[PDB]
Amino acid sequence: TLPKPFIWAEPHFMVPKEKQVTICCQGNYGAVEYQLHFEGSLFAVDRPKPPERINKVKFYIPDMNSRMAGQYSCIYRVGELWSEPSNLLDLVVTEMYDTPTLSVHPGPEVISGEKVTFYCRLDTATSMFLLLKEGRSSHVQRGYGKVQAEFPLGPVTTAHRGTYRCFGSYNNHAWSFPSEPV
């Protein structure tokens, strides 16, 4: 019937403070309105001047702050009908206040099958910390701990290779500066 839109962040969903971010929404051709919803409230609207000629919209933030970090969804209009919301976009503002320390247990590079547990400290932060594997399969691993958080990996494998980074958080969407790589 009315296809579900796709929302994404350019360059990436991890936007350091006062950096530019463009949220893109791909709806359908001949759609009259395109809405960006921020944390359950209308944030922005794009009305494609030639509507039949357009299937996508660009929303851009010029200076990224904490005030605009959070959950984004996209919705578009055809007549008086509204498409069901797009996937959720979690816009995270990085480089907020401090740099956390990233230690590794037992060592920086080890023999396979060894139990590896990454550690990340930063007082003056929340109990939530994030572990990130740079590049190839850039997934985020969430960790809990007062002042120091434990990121167990267990028996290491060849995929467990890579340069890792740690972020502390001031809320789920406002993370600290990245920690020195491992």
Epitope: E33, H37, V45, P51, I75, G79, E80, L81, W82, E84
Partner: antibody, heavy 117, light 108 residues
Framework: QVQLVQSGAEVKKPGASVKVSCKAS????????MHWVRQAPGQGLEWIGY????????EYNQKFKDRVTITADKSTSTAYMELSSLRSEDTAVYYC??????????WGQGTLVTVSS | DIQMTQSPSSLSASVGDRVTITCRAS??????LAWFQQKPGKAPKLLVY???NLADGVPSRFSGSGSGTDYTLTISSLQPEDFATYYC?????????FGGGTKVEIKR
């Protein structure tokens, strides 16, 4: 056999609140939008606002926003409009109207809201 | 805020007459225009949607036209049933705005 059946004619004093119901039948409530349009005695039509039952998302005309609250009951398949702090000029016939891809497909019989002292 | 200016305010025509109602938008609406027929007492009925498209049930004699700002609804030969108040409406931008209305009356 789409039908829109509104609550009966309400009489209100100035400054009061009026809540007008609208029961949707013959079609899939969530699949469409619910708009509220009014018409003053001896006047043209004026858009109040709309609700998307599926999202709960609403948009209002700035003229109201503050005074109005349009709401949707999924389980009872009914939409509502609540207009508070009523001035004389709010006396009108209030229609609930369906929002389809073809615009306003269907409208309810209308509800007479008479506002006076 | 888009302003719809519907012209004329009223018109009187004999049965079997060609009638043309004009509707002018302040901004370019990209065919997001509807037309309604409202008979005395009753609620408006959708006649024309998306500028030119007729609503299911609406007879052949009703025609929608226009491309942006300028739109006209025309009745090829006015029948007794067609005597009503006609309105155009935009659905390009919020708030939805209606035209002032056109009272089509019988000429005698």
């Amino acid at each position: 056999q789409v039908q829109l059946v509104q609550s009966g004619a309400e009489v209100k004093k100035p400054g009061a609140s009026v809540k007008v119901s609208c029961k949707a039948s013959g079609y899939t409530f969530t699949s469409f939008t619910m708009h509220w349009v009014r018409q003053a005695p001896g006047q043209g039509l004026e858009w109040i606002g709309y609700i998307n039952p599926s999202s709960g998302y609403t948009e209002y005309n700035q003229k109201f926003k503050d005074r109005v609250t349009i709401t949707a009951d999924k389980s009872t398949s009914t939409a509502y409009m609540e207009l508070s702090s009523l001035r004389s000029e709010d006396t009108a016939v209030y229609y609930c109207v369906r929002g389809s891809s073809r615009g306003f497909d269907y409208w309810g019989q209308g509800t007479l809201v008479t506002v006076s002292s | 805020d888009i302003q719809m200016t519907q012209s004329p305010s009223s018109l009187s025509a004999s049965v079997g007459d060609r009638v043309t109602i004009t509707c002018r938008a302040s901004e370019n609406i990209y065919s997001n225009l509807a037309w309604f027929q409202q008979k005395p007492g009753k609620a408006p009925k959708l006649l024309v949607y998306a500028a030119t498209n007729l609503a299911d049930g609406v007879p052949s004699r009703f025609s929608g036209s226009g491309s942006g700002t300028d739109y006209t609804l025309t009745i090829s030969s006015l029948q007794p049933e067609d005597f009503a108040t006609y309105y155009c409406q935009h659905f390009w931008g919020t708030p939805r705005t209606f035209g002032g209305g056109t009272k089509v009356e019988i000429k005698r």
